Amino acid sequence: LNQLQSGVNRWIREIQKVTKLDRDPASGTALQEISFWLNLERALYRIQEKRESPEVLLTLDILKHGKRFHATVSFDTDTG
Amino acid sequence: LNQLQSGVNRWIREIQKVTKLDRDPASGTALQEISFWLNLERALYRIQEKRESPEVLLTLDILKHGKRFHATVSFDTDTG
Amino acid sequence: IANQPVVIDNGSGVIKAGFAGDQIPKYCFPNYVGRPKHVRVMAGALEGDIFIGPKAEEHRGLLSIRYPMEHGIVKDWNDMERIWQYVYSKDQLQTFSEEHPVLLTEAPLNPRKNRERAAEVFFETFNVPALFISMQAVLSLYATGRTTGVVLDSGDGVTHAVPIYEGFAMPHSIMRIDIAGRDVSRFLRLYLRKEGYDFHSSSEFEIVKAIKERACYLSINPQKDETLETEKAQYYLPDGSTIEIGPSRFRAPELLFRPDLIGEESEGIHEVLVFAIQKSDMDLRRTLFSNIVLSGGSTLFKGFGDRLLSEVKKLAPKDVKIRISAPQERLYSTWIGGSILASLDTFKKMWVSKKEYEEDGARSIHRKTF
Secondary structure (H helix, E strand, C coil): CHHHHHHHHHHHHHHHHHHCCCCCCCCCCHHHHHHHHHHHHHHHHHHHHHHCCHHHHHHHHHHHHCCCHHHHHHHHHCCC | CHHHHHHHHHHHHHHHHHHCCCCCCCCCCHHHHHHHHHHHHHHHHHHHHHHCCHHHHHHHHHHHHCCCHHHHHHHHHCCC | CCCCCEEEEECCCEEEEEECCCCCCCEEEECCEEEECCCCCCCCCCCCCCEECHHHHHCHHHEEEECCEECCEECCHHHHHHHHHHHCCCCCCCCCCCCCCEEEEECCCCCHHHHHHHHHHHHHHHCCCEEEEEEHHHHHHHHHCCCCEEEEEECCCCEEEEEEECCEECHHHCEEECCCHHHHHHHHHHHHHHHCCCCCCHHHHHHHHHHHHHCCECCCCHHHHHHCCCCCCEEECCCCCEEECCCHHHHCCHHHHCCCCCCCCCCCHHHHHHHHHHHCCHHHHHHHHHCEEEECHHHHCECHHHHHHHHHHHHCCCCCCCCEECCCCCCCHHHHHHHHHHHCCCHHHHCEEHHHHHHHCHHHHHHCCC
């Protein structure tokens, strides 16, 4: 359970690295803007597809069954 | 027992040296005085650490069993 | 920025403190201040004129006890300052107060003066970075991992039912009654005097509390148990003398389900629960009855769950499914919830900043507590 907890912590930190990305509007070209926004959208969709995979759902289910609600609630909420 | 009592006498005298360091504030810079007090902080914690060492505690227990109560009491309370 | 927030559940009976992330409250200890009543004569005595936490416990006989907060309100603020300082002592949490944020859990419908003075004490005395008053029911639901339910928290000083549905609390449905475990122990002391054992002294009162812990059960039928003969279980006092309880064993905790016994015309615990649910809207009632979460130390009484189920079944509408969920860690549920909530980065948005409090004062904390 502790190993799964630390793994979910790593997952949450990695997801927050991508979800919290923000671009300064003033800097760079609008071409860079469109590239940034589409790349971010593709990354989020890939992350979402990974998140719905049976592995992550199984991990969350194991953590719930062990009453380790820290990681599960954080993953459901902190990721944004 | 007399040897260990003399050792305890040495210990209480040495600890009295550290506890009774009183510095003339006029002699030295502000850095010197604050350094003196911080070193005193860490030194008194080190004396707490030494006081709890197993060998000294065994010494005190031995003096108690030999009923040299004067040395044990002086070590416990008179150190300041 | 800061490294880690500190969760402090300042329950009236026991105060439970630890760091956010820890699965268990690392440092939980009784919520009273003990001062020596006898005279010091021999050097090498116990140091300090104030005793808190375990050190008071090993030397309980020497001390006069003083509870700082009674029914969840801090009557003595200097003592509460002292115990909060003890929470940061070298014994517990061994860290500076100005470095870590703090989460504090107060009982619902408490006086406004209580929360504002609390925020004052944390922000001026301790110079904490950020503070967040919180409701115990929300944390209990977080710890159980539920967004719905009715939290019936019966701590030492106060009992209260809060209905929460899908992360929304109905504030007008929150029922609070001051009858709680400490009152049960007072009632038990009175009955033990009636049986012929006196515990007038303050330190003795903790013995009465331990008696309440060890040998007290809630009967399914109080009257049928009353007419029948008791078992008269004996309890050994710390010195060695025994005391025989008998009929007071079950008549004591029945104070919770009938406050008429002490003489207070207040709602019973089952009445608190059913009124809290019924006071809500119709559509949710079934789900609320389906989700009941028990918290607080007073819920650990033997037979509490079954008696409560019988009472709510009698008072609830017929053919309704009642399911009372009693986790194993009821006593530390609220702190675990506080830890979970603090661990969330969203906590960064709820708490009040020291600069914000200084700029706005009590208005800021009053806004960001409800």
